[PDB]
């Protein structure tokens, strides 16, 4: 025989190996392929689809359809409408979005996050809303005058129903970790009345908006891992 | 002059108009089509009923209330008793169809609410007994044009025989996934301040070229109130939701005597 | 091919309003940072290599644990411990199943790998010679063994692998074997149409993929006759989908499975932990 | 019948493959496919939507 010498690794079963193996059903004639709609090539295609943030997952609303709609009214309070950390894998509200679920199969993420808001009041309701992203390392914003110093958009409610706020990729590291982590903290997303919601008479004075999250085309993930979102008894 | 809000759809002898649309969805970017010779399976010359069957059928309307948790239908089940489409479906072993789905819900500039309208391939739903798995009667799975409703509570039956229906739990989309992620499925939203209709054009979707329509629903249609109906003068007001669906590029194989499914 | 680079952009004062849209259309938000902020040029050299379907599925996952024993069996129950049969499925475990169920339909070849382990049942019954295992794939219709040493194990046509304890984990490839043009992960239907006034039972019939799926049976035995020392074995079965295509994405499983279907369990349908307030960083 | 292809880059670069088996099912992983079309899921609309234009005109 050809003289050979076995190296370390010989006979091991590495579950991420990529070797050929003999076919148990040789010369099997596979069913011919046909075109099926909706072919997927990359999990990041799915990450670019909007899914609803369960933004109002408070006691009594968590694990109900009422976890999604963000309460709005015509009272013009100075208190924030919602506040959430840019922790898209680990945050209690972002982890169960479609993007959050995909991120929990990876260790590292990079790129820009898109937050799209749909106003679901009456046509007669008007308003201006400030949506802000504050990169980390300063006092988390709890007032409009701190929020407006960060990346922000002033949304005018009108015929165009929806407004997109970007959390642009602003990071020390080239990737953030898909866990709660001080070193790769992402910063703060907040929302304030810029004016207030105004309605005429015979109109609901309280209403909702829906918040969606998706990945931008600059977004990618690395280091495949098991998710903490599925388990079984043994 | 031409507008994303104003649309006419004509199929066979039937026309829909809308003046408050929001574009239209073509599911997975693919218009329906006939089955090509290079993808064909059954070898008998198919029936292509064209205008007799490929036309708008309007289902019984449902009432949207402040307390509604949502509605579901299956396709082709919802159209099984619809004119010549139903006859062609039941006289043949095999059928394929695309659809134009037109969901209709008008209100006023003073009403508010938002409906998610989702077209779901292989919309498999949970059963309502924990004594068994996958334990749903044919009759409960196939309600026809009346469809079914979602609930915000899960109350599985004491006895297996009493739980042979879907546990249509709204926030789990009746199937153990979070409803907030239903947007990965072809969808529109009817947001009353913006639009009064949703239009989805669906190609045939299956792991086969053609299949047994009486055994197998290709699509679920889900309507979920994402934001509850509200109207300040009367919180108890009801507005209709009307579902109108046209089969498209229908093709049938394996003609014999008519299929008459069990009713109990 | 790389993920998107960011172009150099300054401000705007314009009737062009890329920040506004209408998601009622069924379109997701499309705007990117250059639409709503001043951006520098950043060249993006990073790729989506590890999120291709081949990369996402490119792992051998444990799908079941089988048990077989080798000892002098004197009862029916003990005779049935000398071999095992398993209906081939990915639904005994949750991890690979959940990844596949991001999709409605799939097409792939399968790499199957096995990890075989033993222990002595007792210390007072001497020793056991090194054991050979037979793992026989019984396609639907082929006769199933009723004893560890019956005629079925001659395996003239069924594929078998003979594995020697302590050797490298055994491994073989299976083609895409589906009788349809893809595997269905979900089937909204039944195996037959129940007809008007038929006498066939409608009270104990099932629904969905469980009514139509059959990938056959794995049969495992120890080929050796019994030693005085009883040996108990575990066979861990691993699946890696390769040459993967998938269609029609789905929301992933959000709550525990309770069987082969989509059914959920009343005590396990609250995946979210409630936040203190809508304003909790 | 050796195939020579680019490796995935590391810290700091071709590799050779020969298929040993008569069944393609026996082959190692498919080569990296960077194909994508997110628009079939993110924008499956009949009428083109220009980002800078109103979504509804
Ligand atoms: C599986 C198991 O628990 N086996 C144990 C056995 C059995 O219980 C008895 O031998 C049966 O009578 O007992 C031991 O003390 C022994 O034999 O050395 C330890 C051994 O681990
Ligand atoms: Ca004809
Ligand atoms: Ca680039
Ligand atoms: Ca726009
Ligand atoms: Ca700019
Ligand atoms: Cl009916
Ligand atoms: Cl009957
Ligand atoms: Cl033998
Ligand atoms: Cl022997």
Numbering used by the authors:
A (entry chain 333): 341 to 574
B (entry chain 222): 77 to 340
C (entry chain 111): 605 to 885
D (entry chain 444): 2 to 13, 25 to 69
Task: List sentences quoted exactly from the publication behind this structure.
CVA24v attaches to cells via shallow, surface exposed, Neu5Ac pockets.
As a starting point to probe this strategy, divalent Neu5Ac compounds posed as attractive tools as they have potential to bind to the virion by simultaneously occupying two Neu5Ac binding sites. Compounds with a C2–C9 linkage between the two Neu5Ac entities proved more efficacious blocking CVA24v transduction than C4–C9 and C2–C2 linked compounds. To investigate the binding of compounds 16–21, we derivatized CVA24v by soaking CVA24v crystals in crystallization solution containing the corresponding compound (16 mM). The following structure determination resulted in data sets with resolutions below or around 2 Å and showed that all compounds, beside 17, bind by their Neu5Ac entity to the characterized binding site. A plausible reason is the C2–C9 linkage of these dimeric compounds. Thus, we find it likely that the spacer unit that links the C2 position of one Neu5Ac entity to the C9 position of a second Neu5Ac entity is floating in the solvent in a non-ordered fashion rather than folding back towards the viral surface to interact with the canyon on top of the VP1 capsid protein.
